[PDB]
Amino acid sequence: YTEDSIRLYLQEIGRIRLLRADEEIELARQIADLLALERIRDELLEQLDRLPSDAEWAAAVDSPLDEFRRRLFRGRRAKDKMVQSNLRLVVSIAKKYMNRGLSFQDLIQEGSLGLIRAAEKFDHEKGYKFSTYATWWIRQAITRAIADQSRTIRLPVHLYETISRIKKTTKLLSQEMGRKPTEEEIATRMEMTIEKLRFIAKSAQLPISLETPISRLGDFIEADGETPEDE
Amino acid sequence: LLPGAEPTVKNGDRVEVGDVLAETKLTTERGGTVRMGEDNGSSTHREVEIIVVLDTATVKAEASQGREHYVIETKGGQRFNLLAAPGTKVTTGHVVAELIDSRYRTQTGGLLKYSGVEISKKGRAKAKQGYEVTKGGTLLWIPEETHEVNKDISLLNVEDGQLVEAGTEVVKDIFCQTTGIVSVTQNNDILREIVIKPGDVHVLDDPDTAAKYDEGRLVNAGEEVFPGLTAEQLVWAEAVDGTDGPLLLLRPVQELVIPDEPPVPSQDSSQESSSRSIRLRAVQRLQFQDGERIKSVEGVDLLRTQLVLESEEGSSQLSADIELLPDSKDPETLRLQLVIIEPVVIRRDVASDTTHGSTHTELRVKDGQKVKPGAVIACTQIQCKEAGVVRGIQEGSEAVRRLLVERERDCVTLDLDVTAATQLQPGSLIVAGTQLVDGIIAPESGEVRAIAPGQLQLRIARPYRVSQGAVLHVEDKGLVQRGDN
Amino acid sequence: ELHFLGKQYKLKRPKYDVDEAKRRDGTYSVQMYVPTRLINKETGEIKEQE
DNA sequence: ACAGGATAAA
DNA sequence: TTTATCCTGTTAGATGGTT
């Protein structure tokens, strides 16, 4: 009866055995069948402007309602197992950003979405291991989540990319010239105005908390209003 | 007195300054050869080591890719690689060196057959370490290249039983390395195992010949495999189902002959005083069992010749350090050596109030000497700082931890009349300030040592009153120093 | 493998000065440079640098 | 992280 | 016109934490 939540999640994960490549291929085939069936249903939804009933959906596949429903179930369970047995991969990738703005548990749950998408777009016919395709999606989901959920004043992804390129250019100039580059040099190298560079530098800052010891910061800030004297 | 120290004197022995009071004897537990450490700026060896030796080889330290590997050149010209680094302790049975051999290294995987070769049957857990051969013989090696994958069917490029050349992309991103027939294994539209086996192929026209080769067979050189077909060298003939039906495959069988005993010269221990001799036994191990069907794209090592540390029974728990001895005749030439070093630690002499006497340790042996088990190695003697009389050493069943020396300045003489002082006895307890005789008052307290005509000997003493119910931290006739409760 | 030969760390002379740092509201410091050697466990190419 | 594409807001 | 902001995809293999 531990109180830790991450350890409990890791235990819940460890109760699942890793898949094998043949198991991956089988599950990928069932997942593809489920995806095609879902696409058909979506077509029925466009035709009916409503959710099709199981009987209408079974009729759309010329399949007995029992056979159709069992096929649907198998596909659901296949996708479920594919995601479930790879959560360990999700944790292995998510542990590499535990100090960037999102807590470890948030990284895990955001990488789970990438794993789900990877399991939805895996192609067995490609002839590759699922652990190679899934890594890209897990990493992308975690990086996007960090870009969109790490700051109180959220910055767009293009701003993160701009800041990264500014850092790389600054390091390259420092290595080339053997000294710290100036603002004008960096602005010329980046082909952008110095005011834009200063704006990027100002927007990259982290907001300081009101309760920073100085005694707290929040007790030294005046209030917006009209002074009784000025009325 | 230190733990295990034994006094050399009895109660009452009048000793002089510097004389031995107590001694600690260090003895060798098992005996052997003495090794004295070099005088590293100290004229007193703080440690002495107990040691058999083997030398009759040559050793050179060569640097390859920044790694210092030791090559053991035997007097017969054979070469070994030293798998164990200097300073490492290994027990009995551990591999020390590996024969640098390439003859028994295959190019690819395949199948293994035994011919008269026999092995020891002790232990399955040693399978990773191989199988020790109990009798030499002939190994038959049937080559094959096995690509083990778990990939889907539609990636396949080659037909079951197609005769191929090496380099063909049999499966997407998989390249064959051997020119032969490809046999394909699939499970529910999933490619599992692909096999390429070299050897000549030939048409099977007569079903009876195929029935003879239903299970595969060996055929010697010159022996006619079937009418019109004679094997020029020993080959494995097996019936395989190719694209058009039955075919006969003649895979080239390799023969590797292993001698009954590894012909690598052992090096003999040179010291008889070690009743538990230590030696290097050369062993031959086959890493795979009879008929073990091996699947490997790259070559494997079949036979390994390993030097193994061996010792007499009862010494199985001994661990031997590994050292290099520079040869006396040629210092450049180094020789590998295994020692069962046993340490004996000598404490530095301390004369400053630890025992309150000078502790001096003298060795009882010389470097290179041969000692029996239990022989005394070192004697540490405690020398008294001040002459006097030794007391406080009680007898029986307890280790002497503290002794007492009553010195010249712990006795005082006083001029008192014997005639009327007859009320006192040697060993009386005199409280100072007490009227000993009419008009005579005790100047200082003490114990009555002697009563001479007109004189009195007092050993200085001081009392402490104790009331009923107190707790006693000490014992009668004990020994206490300054500050003790 | 990266090896940091930390027994040979050199120190670069402080920039500005003590008084210049005081009057500029900066920091009085030096720069630390340690020699390192990246060793490839196989190829064996060692790219020594500071 | 990085590249391509769609779009609307400046 | 010209960016500012959002969306989707990526094929060696990888698969349970630090303080």
Which string of DSSP letters, residue by residue, matches B277-291? -EEEEEEEEESS-TT
Give the residue ranges with Cβ < 7 A from strand E. A 4, 6-7, 10-11, 13-14, 18-19, 85-89, 91-92, 95, 98, 104, 117, 121-123, 126, 128-133, 135-137, 139-140, 144, 156-159
E strand or H helix that includes residue B49: strand B47-50
Cα of B293 vs its chain's centroid, Å: 37
Q: For residue B478, give the nearest of B406, B401, B409 by alpha carbon.
A: B401
* Overall size of chain B counted in residues: 485
Q: List protein-proximal bases of chain E (any atom < 7 A from a CB).
A: 4-18
Q: Distance in angstroms, CA of B225 to C1' of E10?
A: 57
Measured between CA atoms, how close is A128 to chain B, in angstroms? Answer: 8
Question: Packing angle between helix A130-149 and helix A87-94, nearest 10 degrees?
Answer: 50
Strands in B131-135's sheet, in edge-to-edge order, are B89-90, B320-326, B334-339, B58-64, B67-73, B79-82, B95-99, B303-311, B278-286, B131-135, B118-119
In terms of CA atoms, which chain B residue is nearest residue A22?
Answer: B150
- Taking the C1' atom of every nucleotide in all shown strands and the CA of A123, the nearest one is E11
Q: For residue B380, give the nearest of B400, B404, B399, B363 by alpha carbon.
A: B363
Strands in B342-345's sheet, in edge-to-edge order, are B342-345, B47-50, B32-36, B370-371
The CA-to-CA distance between both ends of chain A, in Å, stands at 63
Which residues in chain C are followed by a discontinuity, with C-to-N distance exceeding 2.5 angstroms?
none
Strands B224-226 and B229-230: antiparallel
Q: Report residue A56 as tokens.
A: 């209408």
Ramachandran quadrant class, A154 (left: phi over 0; alpha: psi -120 to 50; beta: rest):
beta
Count of CB atoms within 10 A of residue A132's CB?
10
Bridge partner list, B201: B249
Give the integer Cα–Cα distance in Å for B14 and B452.
21
Of B152, B187, B188, the CB nearest to A127: B152
Q: For residue A41, give the nearest of A60, A67, A68, A66 by alpha carbon.
A: A60
Q: Distance in angstroms, CA of A162 to C1' of D7?
A: 21
Q: Do A22 and B173 touch (CB under 8 A)?
A: no
E strand or H helix that includes residue C36: strand C36-39
Q: Report residue B231 as tokens.
A: 């094997």
Ramachandran quadrant class, B217 (left: phi over 0; alpha: psi -120 to 50; beta: rest):
beta
Bridge partner list, A74: none
Q: Report residue A130 as tokens.
A: 């699922």
B464 phi, psi to nearest 5 deg: -140, 120
Ramachandran quadrant class, A97 (left: phi over 0; alpha: psi -120 to 50; beta: rest):
alpha
Count of CB atoms within 10 A of residue B476's CB?
5
Strands in B217-219's sheet, in edge-to-edge order, are B200-203, B245-252, B235-242, B217-219
Amino acid at A154: R
3-state helix, strand, coil in chain C (%, to 5): 15, 35, 50
Q: What is the DSSP string of B63-97?
A: EETTEEEEEEE-TTS-EEEE-S-TT-EE-TT-EEE
E strand or H helix that includes residue B460: strand B455-460
Q: Residues near B26 by Cβ (< 8 Å), separated by ≥ 6?
A: B344, B346, B376, B377, B378, B379, B380
Measured between CA atoms, how close is A139 to chain B, in angstroms? Answer: 25
Amino acid at A118: A
Q: What is the DSSP string of B398-449?
A: S-----EEE-GGGEEEE---TTTGGG--TT-EE-TT-EEETTEE-SS-EEEE
Asked if residue B383 lies in contact with residue B19, where contact means CB atoms within 8 angstroms, the answer is yes
Question: Packing angle between helix A87-94 and helix A104-120, nearest 10 degrees?
Answer: 130
Contacts 24+ apart (CB under 8 A), A165-172: A165/A190, A166/A190, A166/A197, A166/A200
Q: Residues near A144 by Cβ (< 8 Å), separated by ≥ 6?
A: A110, A157
Residues of chain A with Cβ-Cβ distance to B152 below 8 Å are: 25, 124-125, 127
Chains that touch A (3 or more CB pairs under 8 A): B
Residues of chain C with Cβ-Cβ distance to B66 below 8 Å are: 39, 44
Q: Report residue C10 as tokens.
A: 């050199």
Asked if residue B135 lies in contact with residue B118, where contact means CB atoms within 8 angstroms, the answer is yes
Give the integer Cα–Cα distance in Å for B255 and B220.
12
Please give the torsion angle defined by the CA atoms of residues B78, B83, B84 and B86, in that order, rounded to the nearest 10 degrees: 60
Query: Burial of B278 by CB count in 10 Å (0-12 exposed, 13-18 middle, 19+ buried)?
Result: buried
E strand or H helix that includes residue C46: strand C46-49
Q: Do A22 and B154 touch (CB under 8 A)?
A: no
Asked if residue B353 lies in contact with residue B79, where contact means CB atoms within 8 angstroms, the answer is no
Measured between CA atoms, how close is B67 to chain C, in angstroms? Answer: 10
A188 phi, psi to nearest 5 deg: -65, -45
Q: CB-based contact (8 Å) between C1 and chain B?
A: no
Give the integer Cα–Cα distance in Å for B214 and B241.
11
- Taking the C1' atom of every nucleotide in all shown strands and the CA of A103, the nearest one is E17
Give the integer Cα–Cα distance in Å for B393 and B403.
6
Q: For residue A114, give the nearest of A83, A154, A88 by alpha carbon.
A: A83
Angle at B286 between CA B281 and CA B290, to 5 degrees: 140
Q: Do B66 and C44 touch (CB under 8 A)?
A: yes
In terms of CA atoms, which chain A residue is nearest residue B154?
Answer: A125
Q: Report residue B405 as tokens.
A: 């020396």
Asked if residue B115 lies in contact with residue B127, where contact means CB atoms within 8 angstroms, the answer is no
Ramachandran quadrant class, B161 (left: phi over 0; alpha: psi -120 to 50; beta: rest):
left
A94 phi, psi to nearest 5 deg: -75, -20
Measured between CA atoms, how close is A58 to chain B, in angstroms? Answer: 27
Which residues in chain A are followed by a discontinuity, with C-to-N distance exceeding 2.5 angstroms?
214
Q: Residues near B431 by Cβ (< 8 Å), separated by ≥ 6?
A: B442, B445, B463
Alpha helix stretches (DSSP H) within B96-156 = none
E strand or H helix that includes residue B311: strand B303-311
Of B155, B187, B192, the CB nearest to A127: B155
Give the integer Cα–Cα distance in Å for A21 and A132.
12
Q: Do B66 and C42 touch (CB under 8 A)?
A: no
Range 151-180 of B in CB contact (< 8 A) with A: 151-152, 154-155, 172-173
Q: Residues near A142 by Cβ (< 8 Å), separated by ≥ 6?
A: A93, A94, A97, A107, A110, A111, A114
Asked if residue A181 lies in contact with residue A167, where contact means CB atoms within 8 angstroms, the answer is no
Q: Distance in angstroms, CA of B172 to C1' of E9?
A: 24
Query: Burial of B237 by CB count in 10 Å (0-12 exposed, 13-18 middle, 19+ buried)?
Result: buried
Secondary structure E strands in B327-403: 334-339, 342-345, 358-363, 370-371, 376-383, 388-391
Cα of B217 vs its chain's centroid, Å: 49
Q: What is the DSSP string of A175-212?
A: HHHSSPPPHHHHHHHHTS-HHHHHHHHHHTPPPPPTT-
Q: What resolution in angstroms, rounded to 1 decimal?
A: 2.5
The CA-to-CA distance between both ends of chain C, in Å, stands at 15
Residues of chain C with Cβ-Cβ distance to B64 below 8 Å are: none
Question: Packing angle between helix A130-149 and helix A157-177, nearest 10 degrees?
Answer: 100
Give the integer Cα–Cα distance in Å for B284 and B120.
11
Measured between CA atoms, how close is C48 to chain B, in angstroms? Answer: 15
Bridge partner list, B233: none
Asked whether the CA dihedral B47, B51, B54, B55 is positive or negative, the reply is positive
Q: Distance in angstroms, CA of B80 to C1' of E9?
A: 56
Give the integer Cα–Cα distance in Å for A89 and A83.
10
Strands C10-12 and B446-452: unpaired
Please give the torsion angle defined by the CA atoms of residues A10, A15, A21 and A22, in that order, rounded to the nearest 10 degrees: -160
Give the integer Cα–Cα distance in Å for B145 and B179.
10
Q: For residue B133, give the nearest of B257, B255, B260 by alpha carbon.
A: B260
B287 phi, psi to nearest 5 deg: -80, 0
Give the integer Cα–Cα distance in Å for B155 and A185.
54
